[PDB]
CSV table of C-alpha atoms (C1' of nucleotides) and ligand atoms in Angstrom, one decimal:
chain,number,residue,atom,x,y,z
A,8,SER,CA,0.0,0.0,0.0
A,9,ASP,CA,1.0,3.6,-0.7
A,10,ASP,CA,0.6,4.5,3.0
A,11,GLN,CA,2.4,1.3,4.1
A,12,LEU,CA,5.1,2.1,1.6
A,13,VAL,CA,5.8,5.5,3.3
A,14,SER,CA,5.6,3.9,6.7
A,15,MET,CA,7.7,0.9,7.6
A,16,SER,CA,11.2,0.2,9.0
A,17,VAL,CA,14.3,0.4,6.9
A,18,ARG,CA,14.5,-3.3,7.5
A,19,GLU,CA,10.7,-4.1,7.5
A,20,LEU,CA,10.6,-2.7,3.9
A,21,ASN,CA,13.6,-4.8,2.7
A,22,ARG,CA,12.0,-8.0,4.1
A,23,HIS,CA,8.8,-7.1,2.1
A,24,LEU,CA,10.5,-6.4,-1.2
A,25,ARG,CA,11.6,-10.0,-1.7
A,26,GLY,CA,9.4,-11.4,-4.6
A,27,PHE,CA,9.6,-8.1,-6.6
A,28,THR,CA,12.0,-7.7,-9.4
A,29,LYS,CA,15.2,-5.7,-8.9
A,30,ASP,CA,14.2,-2.8,-11.2
A,31,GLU,CA,10.8,-2.8,-9.5
A,32,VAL,CA,12.5,-2.6,-6.1
A,33,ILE,CA,14.1,0.7,-7.1
A,34,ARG,CA,10.8,2.1,-8.5
A,35,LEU,CA,9.2,1.6,-5.0
A,36,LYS,CA,12.4,2.8,-3.2
A,37,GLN,CA,12.1,6.0,-5.3
A,38,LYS,CA,8.3,6.1,-4.5
A,39,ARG,CA,9.2,6.1,-0.8
A,40,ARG,CA,11.6,9.1,-1.2
A,41,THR,CA,9.2,10.9,-3.5
A,42,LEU,CA,6.3,10.4,-1.1
A,43,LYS,CA,8.4,11.4,2.0
A,44,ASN,CA,9.6,14.5,0.0
A,45,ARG,CA,5.9,15.5,-0.5
A,46,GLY,CA,5.7,15.6,3.3
A,47,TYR,CA,8.9,17.5,3.8
A,48,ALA,CA,8.0,20.2,1.3
A,49,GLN,CA,4.7,20.8,3.1
A,50,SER,CA,6.5,21.2,6.4
A,51,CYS,CA,9.0,23.5,4.7
A,52,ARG,CA,6.1,25.7,3.5
A,53,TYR,CA,4.9,26.2,7.0
A,54,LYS,CA,8.4,26.9,8.3
A,55,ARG,CA,8.9,29.5,5.5
A,56,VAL,CA,5.7,31.3,6.6
A,57,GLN,CA,7.0,31.3,10.2
A,58,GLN,CA,10.3,32.7,9.0
A,59,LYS,CA,8.5,35.3,6.8
A,60,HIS,CA,6.5,36.5,9.8
A,61,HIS,CA,9.5,36.5,12.2
A,62,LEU,CA,11.4,38.8,9.9
A,63,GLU,CA,8.3,41.0,9.5
A,64,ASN,CA,8.0,41.0,13.3
A,65,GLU,CA,11.6,42.0,13.8
A,66,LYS,CA,11.2,44.9,11.4
A,67,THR,CA,8.2,46.0,13.5
A,68,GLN,CA,10.3,45.9,16.7
A,69,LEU,CA,13.2,47.7,15.2
A,70,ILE,CA,11.0,50.5,14.0
A,71,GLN,CA,9.4,51.1,17.5
A,72,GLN,CA,13.0,51.0,18.8
A,73,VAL,CA,13.9,53.7,16.3
A,74,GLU,CA,10.9,55.9,17.4
A,75,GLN,CA,11.7,55.5,21.0
A,76,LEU,CA,15.4,56.3,20.6
A,77,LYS,CA,14.5,59.3,18.4
A,78,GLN,CA,12.1,60.4,21.2
A,79,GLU,CA,15.1,60.1,23.6
A,80,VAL,CA,17.4,62.1,21.4
A,81,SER,CA,14.9,65.0,21.3
A,82,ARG,CA,14.3,65.2,25.0
A,83,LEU,CA,18.1,64.9,25.9
A,84,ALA,CA,18.4,67.7,23.3
A,85,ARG,CA,15.8,69.8,25.1
A,86,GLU,CA,17.8,69.5,28.3
A,87,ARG,CA,21.1,70.3,26.6
A,88,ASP,CA,19.5,73.4,24.9
A,89,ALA,CA,18.2,74.8,28.2
A,90,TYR,CA,21.4,74.1,30.1
A,91,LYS,CA,23.6,75.4,27.3
A,92,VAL,CA,22.0,78.8,27.5
A,93,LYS,CA,22.3,79.2,31.3
A,94,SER,CA,26.0,78.0,31.0
B,7,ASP,CA,6.7,25.1,-32.3
B,8,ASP,CA,7.3,25.8,-28.6
B,9,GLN,CA,8.1,29.4,-29.8
B,10,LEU,CA,4.3,29.3,-30.0
B,11,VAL,CA,4.7,31.5,-26.9
B,12,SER,CA,6.4,34.0,-29.2
B,13,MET,CA,3.8,34.7,-31.9
B,14,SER,CA,1.3,37.5,-31.2
B,15,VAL,CA,-2.5,37.3,-31.1
B,16,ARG,CA,-2.8,38.5,-34.7
B,17,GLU,CA,0.1,36.2,-35.8
B,18,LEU,CA,-1.4,33.3,-33.9
B,19,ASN,CA,-5.0,33.4,-34.9
B,20,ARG,CA,-4.0,33.2,-38.6
B,21,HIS,CA,-1.7,30.3,-37.7
B,22,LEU,CA,-4.8,28.6,-36.1
B,23,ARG,CA,-7.1,29.2,-39.2
B,24,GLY,CA,-5.8,25.9,-40.8
B,25,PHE,CA,-6.5,23.7,-37.8
B,26,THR,CA,-9.6,21.9,-36.5
B,27,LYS,CA,-11.5,22.9,-33.3
B,28,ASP,CA,-9.9,20.1,-31.3
B,29,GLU,CA,-6.4,21.0,-32.5
B,30,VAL,CA,-7.1,24.7,-31.6
B,31,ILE,CA,-8.1,23.7,-28.0
B,32,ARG,CA,-4.9,21.7,-27.6
B,33,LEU,CA,-2.5,24.4,-29.0
B,34,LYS,CA,-4.2,27.2,-27.0
B,35,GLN,CA,-3.7,25.2,-23.8
B,36,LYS,CA,0.0,24.5,-24.6
B,37,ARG,CA,0.3,28.2,-25.1
B,38,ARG,CA,-1.1,29.1,-21.7
B,39,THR,CA,1.0,26.3,-20.1
B,40,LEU,CA,4.1,27.7,-21.8
B,41,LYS,CA,3.1,31.3,-21.2
B,42,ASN,CA,2.5,30.4,-17.5
B,43,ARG,CA,5.9,28.7,-17.2
B,44,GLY,CA,7.6,32.0,-18.0
B,45,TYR,CA,5.2,33.9,-15.7
B,46,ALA,CA,6.3,31.6,-12.9
B,47,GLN,CA,10.0,32.5,-13.7
B,48,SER,CA,9.0,36.1,-13.4
B,49,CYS,CA,7.3,35.8,-10.1
B,50,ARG,CA,10.5,34.2,-8.7
B,51,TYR,CA,12.7,36.9,-10.0
B,52,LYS,CA,10.4,39.6,-8.7
B,53,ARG,CA,10.4,37.8,-5.4
B,54,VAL,CA,14.2,37.7,-5.0
B,55,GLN,CA,14.4,41.4,-5.8
B,56,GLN,CA,12.0,42.2,-3.0
B,57,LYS,CA,13.5,39.6,-0.7
B,58,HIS,CA,16.8,41.6,-1.0
B,59,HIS,CA,15.2,45.0,-0.5
B,60,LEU,CA,13.9,43.6,2.8
B,61,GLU,CA,17.4,42.4,3.9
B,62,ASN,CA,18.8,45.9,3.2
B,63,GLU,CA,15.8,47.4,5.0
B,64,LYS,CA,16.7,45.4,8.2
B,65,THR,CA,20.4,46.0,7.8
B,66,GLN,CA,19.9,49.8,7.6
B,67,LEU,CA,17.8,49.6,10.8
B,68,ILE,CA,20.1,47.4,12.8
B,69,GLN,CA,22.6,50.2,12.3
B,70,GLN,CA,20.2,53.1,12.6
B,71,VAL,CA,19.7,52.0,16.2
B,72,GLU,CA,23.4,52.4,16.7
B,73,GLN,CA,23.9,56.0,15.7
B,74,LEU,CA,20.8,56.7,17.8
B,75,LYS,CA,22.3,55.0,20.8
B,76,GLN,CA,25.6,56.8,20.2
B,77,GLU,CA,23.7,60.1,19.6
B,78,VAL,CA,21.9,59.8,22.9
B,79,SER,CA,25.1,58.8,24.9
B,80,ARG,CA,26.7,61.8,23.1
B,81,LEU,CA,23.8,64.1,24.2
B,82,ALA,CA,24.2,62.6,27.7
B,83,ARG,CA,27.7,64.0,28.2
B,84,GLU,CA,27.0,67.2,26.3
B,85,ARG,CA,23.9,68.0,28.3
B,86,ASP,CA,25.9,67.4,31.5
B,87,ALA,CA,28.8,69.6,30.5
B,88,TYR,CA,26.3,72.5,30.4
B,89,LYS,CA,24.6,70.9,33.5
B,90,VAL,CA,27.8,71.0,35.7
B,91,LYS,CA,28.3,74.6,34.4
C,23,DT,C1',-20.6,38.2,-22.4
C,24,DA,C1',-15.9,35.7,-23.7
C,25,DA,C1',-11.4,35.2,-23.9
C,26,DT,C1',-6.7,36.3,-23.1
C,27,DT,C1',-3.3,37.8,-20.3
C,28,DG,C1',-0.2,38.4,-16.2
C,29,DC,C1',0.6,37.4,-11.6
C,30,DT,C1',0.8,34.7,-7.3
C,31,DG,C1',-0.3,31.0,-3.6
C,32,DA,C1',0.1,26.3,-3.2
C,33,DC,C1',1.4,22.1,-4.5
C,34,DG,C1',4.6,18.2,-5.8
C,35,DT,C1',9.0,17.1,-8.1
C,36,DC,C1',14.0,16.9,-8.1
C,37,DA,C1',18.9,18.0,-6.9
C,38,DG,C1',22.1,18.9,-3.2
C,39,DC,C1',23.8,19.3,1.2
C,40,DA,C1',24.4,17.7,5.4
C,41,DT,C1',22.9,14.4,9.3
C,42,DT,C1',21.7,10.2,10.8
C,43,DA,C1',21.5,5.0,10.9
D,25,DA,C1',32.5,3.3,2.8
D,26,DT,C1',26.5,2.6,1.9
D,27,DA,C1',22.2,3.8,2.5
D,28,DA,C1',18.6,6.6,4.2
D,29,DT,C1',16.5,10.9,6.0
D,30,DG,C1',15.1,15.9,6.4
D,31,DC,C1',15.4,20.4,4.7
D,32,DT,C1',15.6,23.7,1.2
D,33,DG,C1',16.3,26.3,-3.4
D,34,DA,C1',14.5,26.4,-7.7
D,35,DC,C1',11.5,24.7,-10.9
D,36,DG,C1',6.9,23.7,-13.7
D,37,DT,C1',1.6,23.0,-13.2
D,38,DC,C1',-2.5,24.5,-12.0
D,39,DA,C1',-6.1,27.2,-10.0
D,40,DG,C1',-8.2,31.4,-9.4
D,41,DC,C1',-8.0,36.4,-9.3
D,42,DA,C1',-7.6,41.2,-11.9
D,43,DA,C1',-7.4,43.6,-15.5
D,44,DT,C1',-7.3,43.9,-20.4
D,45,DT,C1',-9.3,42.7,-24.8
E,115,HG,HG1,11.6,26.2,4.7
E,116,HG,HG1,6.2,37.3,-7.1
DNA sequence: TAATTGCTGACGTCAGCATTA
DNA sequence: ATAATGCTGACGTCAGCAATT
């Protein structure tokens, strides 16, 4: 079965490929990789979405960090201005 | 041939005039399939370009928060100079 | 009221690079 | 040294949307 093909032990599978011709063995060995690849690619898509968002979220954080540091610059500059004049 | 993707509407329709309905259906599809193959290549290109622009966007920020930190720690000592005076 | 076009999200394939058994 | 596994970049199909024809 397709499902059973994807799911069995490295050994369990070998002990089940006995009667099948050698060229045929490879076809199903390729089928196992191909099938397993279908799974990996899916999981990769999810991960990529997570990674896309993460970078997006970093950017958000860096921007508010920029605002806040600018807001600090300005106030530290108000104090320097007022103290510069008295001095 | 596969340069079927090349010929324009006007060029193409006239090319089609010889063929049967069924043949037309087949060729028109191969065209969209071919045309789409190139479209996909475009979407990938367009994507790397804007993937980069984003990398630069972050890099310019990671540094912008440096001159800002340095600018504040500069204004710290400069404000104080006129504070202590 | 169609058809064609261009683009993009999502998939499944395949090649490569490690990592693991 | 083999074989298998998982992940990922890039690709080609296909669907379905938007905007032209
Ligand atoms: Hg990924
Ligand atoms: Hg794109």
